[PDB]
Amino acid sequence: KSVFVGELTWKEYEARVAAGDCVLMLPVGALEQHGHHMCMNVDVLLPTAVCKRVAERIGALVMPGLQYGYKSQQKSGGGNHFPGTTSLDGATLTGTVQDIIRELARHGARRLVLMNGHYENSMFIVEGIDLALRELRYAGIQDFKVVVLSYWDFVKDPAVIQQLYPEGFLGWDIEHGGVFETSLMLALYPDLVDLDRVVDHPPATFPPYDVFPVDPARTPAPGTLSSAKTASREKGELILEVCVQGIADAIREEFPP
Amino acid sequence: KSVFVGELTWKEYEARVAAGDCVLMLPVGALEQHGHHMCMNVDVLLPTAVCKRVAERIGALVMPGLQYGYKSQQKSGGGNHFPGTTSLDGATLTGTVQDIIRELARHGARRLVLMNGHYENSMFIVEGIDLALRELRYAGIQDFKVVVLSYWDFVKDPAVIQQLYPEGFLGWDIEHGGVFETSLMLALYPDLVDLDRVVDHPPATFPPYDVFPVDPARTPAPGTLSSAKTASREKGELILEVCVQGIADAIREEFPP
Amino acid sequence: KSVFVGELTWKEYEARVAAGDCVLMLPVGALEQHGHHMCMNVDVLLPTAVCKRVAERIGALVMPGLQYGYKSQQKSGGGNHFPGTTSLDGATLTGTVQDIIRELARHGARRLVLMNGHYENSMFIVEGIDLALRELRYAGIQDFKVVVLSYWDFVKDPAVIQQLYPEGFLGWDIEHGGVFETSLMLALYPDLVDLDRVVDHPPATFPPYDVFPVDPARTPAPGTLSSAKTASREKGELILEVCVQGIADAIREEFPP
Amino acid sequence: KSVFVGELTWKEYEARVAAGDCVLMLPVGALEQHGHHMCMNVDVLLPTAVCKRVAERIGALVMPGLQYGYKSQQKSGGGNHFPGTTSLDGATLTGTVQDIIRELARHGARRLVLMNGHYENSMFIVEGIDLALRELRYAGIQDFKVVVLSYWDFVKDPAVIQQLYPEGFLGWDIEHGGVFETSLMLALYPDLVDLDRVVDHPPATFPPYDVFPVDPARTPAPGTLSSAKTASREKGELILEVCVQGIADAIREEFPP
Amino acid sequence: KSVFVGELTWKEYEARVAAGDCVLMLPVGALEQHGHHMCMNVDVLLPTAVCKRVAERIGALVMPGLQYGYKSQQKSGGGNHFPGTTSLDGATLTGTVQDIIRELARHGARRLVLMNGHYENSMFIVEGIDLALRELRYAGIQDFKVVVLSYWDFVKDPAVIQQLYPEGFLGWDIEHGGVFETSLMLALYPDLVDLDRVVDHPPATFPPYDVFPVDPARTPAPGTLSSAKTASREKGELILEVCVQGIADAIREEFPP
Amino acid sequence: KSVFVGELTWKEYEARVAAGDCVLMLPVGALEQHGHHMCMNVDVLLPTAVCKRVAERIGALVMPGLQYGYKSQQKSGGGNHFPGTTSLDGATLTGTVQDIIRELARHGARRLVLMNGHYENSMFIVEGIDLALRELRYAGIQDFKVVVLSYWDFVKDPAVIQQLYPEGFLGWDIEHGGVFETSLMLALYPDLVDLDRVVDHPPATFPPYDVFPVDPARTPAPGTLSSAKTASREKGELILEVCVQGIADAIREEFPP
Ligand SMILES: CN(CC(=O)O)C(=N)N
Ligand SMILES: CN(CC(=O)O)C(=N)N
């Protein structure tokens, strides 16, 4: 039986919400350049894949993912000047999250996990949540609860980190098109990665400020912020198990049966 | 090679747009109840599948689809009071279309086909197009051209109509969860249809006005506006060929090499 | 005693709402080209005249009409590229409807009929209604009821259609500046019609898609979508009687005294 | 021939704009309580009547009027708590003005007089103008010129002020439903005034601050801010000529042939 | 102890609101040209200084002031074409006021004085208040009360006006950079005024209409609307005492223990 | 002469912009709880003080600061559920930044430094900049340049961190009301800090997700995310010297004479 809301009938969905402890999950991604070696829908594919596996384990349901996210920023995604990257304005993304929460609440759902896969989305997701909860409070509804997370933050264990990051962990911001995402894609969707096309460059660095209009010269030419040369299917399987396990555990604590 | 932009690298996408006559296609759907016998992501699946086949034929590319559409209306989708149906506000959908066109224009793209799969979306797509073209004009850009269509409108041939609907054509508005959509789904995604669960009610009728708040008693209980009892894979293949050929021809005419 | 809210004192209006069953009616029109032979305020004049007569029969009141409507579309109104046509953005029209409903509800009114006279307004009226009912629900109010209708939909009886169209009906979309509107204008405001200036072209036809920017060649040069050559005062008188009776009956059904 | 754009064909309008110096005029009103003795559409009727007469004199055209205006304020209009008064949000009024200027500019018009008839509208009209002119500049259009006025400000001659206000002029703010508007209505629309119903209270006074929520006790009970007991048709004809002459002269100065 | 909320800890603020009759005051200013002789933050400095003194006297607290206000208008502030003047759009100002009231209500505050220092702000403050009170009404809250005032309106007393203006008071609209503001600044912030730089022109006069785009020729070249040649510290101390006493008394009347 | 734009006349400001290389600086803060020991306007005071000193060194000017910022988040500011914290919606803050940039560009300014003092503001500042630059491009203006920075990012040097934190640096997110801000306040505004009121709790830790509505138990009771027990004036003096030097150097690099 599918864990995807889109693949259920309305009667099946209605029955699941009627159970009374139904957890819904919404992947939030982007269409964004991910270097010479990888396709552009990574930020949708990855959180969706993690949601699917988590949902199988905890008996949750997964909503259709948000395919377009906030403008790529130089220090976390290369920058929005790249071809292919197709970004929403903040108000549009916020409004989309807001509308979806409104509707889930109308259905009777009261438990939502927003799983972000594109670094830049976070604060617009937060605003969408706040505006939706504000509206629910207008109608006397205070029992809608949201958990929001970026899936990579669950990769915390010192031992796990040492495997993908031999010379050190430099941050989730510069994991754009690098070892983390490329490894996951080798594990899940190998036909969409070509590791021989990786342009091996040093981890991108930046001064402690930002400049607009964005200057293309300050992003590595391929659009990646770190090299995925050492990425592997094995690394991807490790990340996947650690994420799925950690997120399933967190969701059970926040949304117990 | 994939016809989906999301499955391309940014370099591959850039090269396709650089050729100068590149046609992009954007499916616009919904998450919406489709009766007891069918799943809720039909309005995304169907135009996406048509886009894919058209794109293969004419050498176009397909953008990630809009998964959430405008509020279901009683006379064309059963109504937004149903569980599962998850709808955007008009401003949100319009803004999403507007943002995407802005970004495609930034890439250098100048040819877009919006393929609607949810009846209620049309006017909000139209407004998104207008607002986007207005903004392009502010930059002296007047060579961006948009074709918008709902894929069912290409099924016009009287002989084909009789083959699909022996008892008579009942209008595309009450083809919600009926013979047309169900037949297409039987041909493309048979596991998401269970024809044994079809409730075989007479076609929905309404007076020449609408009432809000939506009154659930005026929609057939299953949520369908007509019966899919006579739906079949064969009808689906006929529809699919008529739509793909007709749309392929139309796009070749409007966007010639 | 006047049926127009604008022609009442606030005390007279207050007393009518205090009866507890008062029906208010809001004409929603446009300023739009209507060919060489007719003036541009038709879409206001016609629903206002119908509202007046319905209100006289059923004891309703009529609000000041919306004078500007949504952008003219090629297939229904000739297109927004014509001179004279003066159109609102979707958000503006939606917001206007939303504000008016808020205010009527504040007065204690709970029964509203929106009578549309311009084809393109419909979905923005729908959104304005939804947003207003949403806000009322925030205040625990769910007894405000809205009927929305386009007045031409009440010309439906086969006997009536045959009498008005002895050569055949051809649809409401291409009844822009054709026999229907022109006949009504000949009956109500003959000084605003010059039938000698009618250009007698064949009915407009279009492919099953739309193109933006609009291509002006696909609209008949005069701006009409069908010929009003056979329009008459008598046809207009029949349309008027049928519309008024039908709408009066519908409103009594939905809003019994 | 008519001076109202709504009563012209699009060809007649196009020809008038093509002449090169065409002045358009837009009345901006309200639906608002005006005491026990006058109807609620005064703020539309009066500037529309003044526009008509000015247009006849100077060869201008008059657009359909804005029927709904900004929220009535206690110190100028009695307050928005009154029945009947039906007010827009600021953003709605601003957007309406903005949309209309955009469209007039599209037609090729470059001269607009906005004639305000409701005190509270002014700053939202100003913002609408500013936003519209900002957008026009984005397209390299800097030759659209707008004159905005409230018609009563043209009553400046001390001899006229004394005829209306022999005990002294107290300001246009408390001139709500008093001698000025009532006199004009007695001259123009006598059937919409019943002077026997005037409540002859002392002129409304307020402290140098404003309180929200609006306190109904601080407005004179009938909703008028001053008594119309001394209003007369003769005074109305005087006001009408003074306004029409003064506005015609101002428009000739600002928009010379 | 400080009367400024910004200079309190959250515990100190919490305790003051917990008392039950706490009055908060919000200065609303502008960054705007004020002639050759005076700095551009006058409209913040002055209401803030008055707020401080009133708050000391009545035991109120003062919120951080709004530093940026609505677009300067020719007849009241010289016009928004001047350098230095940095103005918000109406929606931005309205939204700021709205957000602050929402948050103060969340804290449990129920008494707010908005003290305006920039003529043009008034209607956007009014709209922000209305939108905030609207949202509070959704939650059943009707005990949040707002007093709004422009501080100069409290200089009313005929005797006071004679001392400040022996040769005649000429209205608050042209008191932009003139005797009133300049005198206050000489009393409070003498280093920010250089009276030798005053350009002594006649009081600004305008016709009874406005023109956009703003024509710079119709504003006195220095940007002032009246001459501050006779401004003095003595006049400033009189104004200050009159304003502080008057406003203190008004706030005690409206927000008593 | 003052480095604050508010303290200049419009002529002085105009002259500085006319020089051709004028750098403007805009502090962007918040009104936010900062523990038991410190006042709530810290996030305005601190970046304003740094801006003042930088401006004095490099010959720049400082605009009036944004006093209200985005909603406090649990992991960086304790959460928006605290009293005193007074937060804007995202759209409001974005619009404020957008409006100010528009206006500065109108003055002829082309170089802006946005100095953020409140962690949560960052993405809304980014969106405001993008929308403003988008509008400038509509007018052919592409030479407006913006540098955005949070002043604490310039305390980077290992030797400086070692001196300030002999026990260990634990990150900027939990430097809310801790050693960093409190030390700066002891150096700049000692009367607004009372170190005896510091609650000396262990550093705040959180799971790798966020929950809404915020659970107040996850924030330390005082609202601080780390203890300021060891804060000192001397630490503050060093932070100030390091920040001012680093930022002055960065601005000269990006905006050379
Ligand atoms: C973690 N990621 C992946 C992405 O969002 O592309 C970052 N770029 N920071
Ligand atoms: C054509 N359709 C299918 C759909 O949009 O669900 C209608 N319901 N009218």
Ligand SMILES: CN(CC(=O)O)C(=N)N
């Ligand atoms: C019936 N009408 C009337 C109108 O909107 O002008 C159509 N244009 N379709």
Ligand SMILES: CN(CC(=O)O)C(=N)N
């Ligand atoms: C001048 N007027 C007329 C009106 O707006 O109704 C005032 N109310 N002050």
Ligand SMILES: CN(CC(=O)O)C(=N)N
């Ligand atoms: C009273 N004021 C002061 C100001 O707003 O600058 C006027 N400009 N009219």
Ligand SMILES: CN(CC(=O)O)C(=N)N
């Ligand atoms: C450094 N700061 C200070 C603040 O924003 O209050 C962080 N919260 N990170």
Ligand SMILES: [Mn+2]
């Ligand atoms: Mn990304």
Ligand SMILES: [Mn+2]
């Ligand atoms: Mn549908």
Ligand SMILES: [Mn+2]
């Ligand atoms: Mn029409």
Ligand SMILES: [Mn+2]
């Ligand atoms: Mn009025």
Ligand SMILES: [Mn+2]
């Ligand atoms: Mn001012």
Ligand SMILES: [Mn+2]
């Ligand atoms: Mn902060």
Ligand SMILES: [Zn+2]
């Ligand atoms: Zn990614």
Ligand SMILES: [Zn+2]
């Ligand atoms: Zn469907």
Ligand SMILES: [Zn+2]
């Ligand atoms: Zn029409």
Ligand SMILES: [Zn+2]
């Ligand atoms: Zn009036």
Ligand SMILES: [Zn+2]
């Ligand atoms: Zn001032």
Ligand SMILES: [Zn+2]
């Ligand atoms: Zn802080």
